[PDB]
Design an enzyme around this catalytic site. Structure first.
Site, mmCIF file in Angstrom:
data_model
loop_
_atom_site.group_PDB
_atom_site.id
_atom_site.type_symbol
_atom_site.label_atom_id
_atom_site.label_comp_id
_atom_site.label_asym_id
_atom_site.label_seq_id
_atom_site.Cartn_x
_atom_site.Cartn_y
_atom_site.Cartn_z
ATOM 1 N N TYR A 13 0.875 -1.194 0.083
ATOM 2 C CA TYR A 13 -0.006 0.093 -0.038
ATOM 3 C C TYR A 13 0.753 1.068 0.131
ATOM 4 C CZ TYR A 13 -3.815 3.029 1.059
ATOM 5 O OH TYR A 13 -4.887 4.229 1.086
ATOM 6 N N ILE A 14 1.731 1.443 1.026
ATOM 7 C CA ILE A 14 2.440 2.628 1.312
ATOM 8 C C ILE A 14 3.516 2.301 -0.154
ATOM 9 C CG2 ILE A 14 4.417 3.377 2.227
ATOM 10 C CD1 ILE A 14 3.232 2.525 5.036
ATOM 11 N N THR A 81 10.382 -0.474 1.941
ATOM 12 C CA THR A 81 9.038 -0.450 2.216
ATOM 13 C C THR A 81 8.614 -2.031 2.591
ATOM 14 O OG1 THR A 81 8.733 1.278 0.369
ATOM 15 C CG2 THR A 81 6.824 0.391 1.773
ATOM 16 N N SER A 125 7.619 2.043 11.949
ATOM 17 C CA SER A 125 6.148 2.149 12.404
ATOM 18 C C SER A 125 6.158 2.870 13.694
ATOM 19 C CB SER A 125 5.694 0.847 12.486
ATOM 20 O OG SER A 125 4.615 0.578 13.435
ATOM 21 N N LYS A 164 8.492 -5.102 14.784
ATOM 22 C CA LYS A 164 8.771 -3.966 14.424
ATOM 23 C C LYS A 164 9.853 -2.938 15.208
ATOM 24 C CE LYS A 164 6.340 -3.342 10.554
ATOM 25 N NZ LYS A 164 5.842 -4.634 10.470
#
Length: 321
Positions: A13-14, A81, A125, A164
């Site tokens: 998506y990003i 990404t 994140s 993350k």
């Protein structure tokens, strides 16, 4: 402007949005996907304006050692990404933590041997920033000086945040020792328009609120527009003075607040009236916008990103309103 950069996990998506915006600024984009020959999962990319001439697709398995060695070569910028989507988790170590760390260092190793490299932009994140044990209430302003306590979160089985967090720490230790210039972008829930008929966790949560849910969850998350973090990646790469981490959160909102906005945007839309548990609402808090703003970034407001999300959900056939 018309230089060469690499974007990993281009189907994400990003990443999709970053590719669209990079292509728009005149860049030649070398994008990696699992299978560039499956015209089903790269269709949304080849269709972007400029793609036909400047979108260069390459096959790369994120977990395959050395898979990025050649693709990053000849690039001044590398945007890592690559975001593997959802799946039921059994063992958090082999399924979340290990692949997280492995793919990050896999790409960083590649960047370390690239003489052309000027800067690496790593998509991280907010999960790697806010969970250090301190309370997050209305007057608390979380920022880049906050770092998640992995050990602490492990005790609560918050394994996605742990993955993350360990991954970002690993990245900073590596770039430090290998003299690489890296900046990270740290978004929370990412919503907004869709480029393909696939939803990330955040857009699906919005979908769930409008397609007939009986309740909305008792949860407060930071929310941000996908165009804004994509642009944040470009600005952090292009501005030479940019450094460190960058919080990408335009307000934290409880689901009752998200539902209130939905009612305002869509007066005849059926929406859940009841919260999921009867307990007090998870408090909201604030997240600094200073660093992203220091680069010229303008934040899209939550009521606009929600509108765009619902509009795309209809366009991509997920919602029938």
């Amino acid at each position: 402007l018309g230089n060469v950069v690499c974007v990993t996990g281009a189907s994400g998506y990003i990443a999709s949005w970053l590719v669209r915006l990079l292509l728009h600024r005149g860049y030649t984009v070398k994008a990696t996907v699992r299978d560039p020959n499956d015209p089903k999962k790269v269709d949304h990319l080849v269709k972007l304006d400029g793609a036909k001439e400047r979108l260069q697709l390459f096959k790369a398995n994120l977990l395959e050692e050395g898979a990025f060695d050649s693709v990053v070569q000849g690039c001044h910028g590398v945007f890592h990404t690559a975001s593997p989507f959802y799946h039921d988790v059994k063992d958090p170590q082999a399924e979340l933590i290990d692949p997280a760390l492995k793919g990050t260092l896999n790409v960083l190793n590649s960047c370390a041997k690239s003489p052309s490299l000027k800067r690496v932009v790593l998509t991280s994140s907010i999960a790697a920033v806010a969970y250090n044990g301190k309370p997050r209430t209305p007057d608390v302003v979380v920022d880049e000086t906050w770092f998640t306590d992995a050990d602490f979160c492990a005790k609560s089985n918050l394994w996605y945040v742990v993955s993350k967090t360990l991954a970002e720490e690993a990245a900073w230790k590596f770039v430090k020792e290998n003299n690489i210039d890296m900046v990270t972008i740290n978004p929370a829930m990412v919503i907004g328009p869709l480029l393909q008929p696939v939803l990330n966790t955040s857009a699906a949560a919005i979908l769930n609120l409008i397609n007939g849910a009986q309740t909305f969850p008792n949860a407060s998350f930071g929310w941000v527009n996908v165009k804004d973090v994509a642009n944040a990646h470009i600005l952090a790469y292009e501005n030479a003075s940019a450094s460190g981490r960058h919080c990408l959160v335009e307000r934290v909102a409880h689901y009752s607040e998200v539902v209130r906005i939905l009612r305002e945007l869509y007066p005849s839309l059926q929406l859940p009236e009841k919260c999921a548990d009867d307990k007090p609402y998870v408090p909201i808090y604030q997240v600094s916008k200073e660093k992203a703003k220091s680069l010229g970034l303008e934040y899209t407001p939550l009521e606009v990103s929600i509108k765009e999300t619902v509009e795309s959900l209809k366009e991509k056939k997920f919602a029938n309103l």
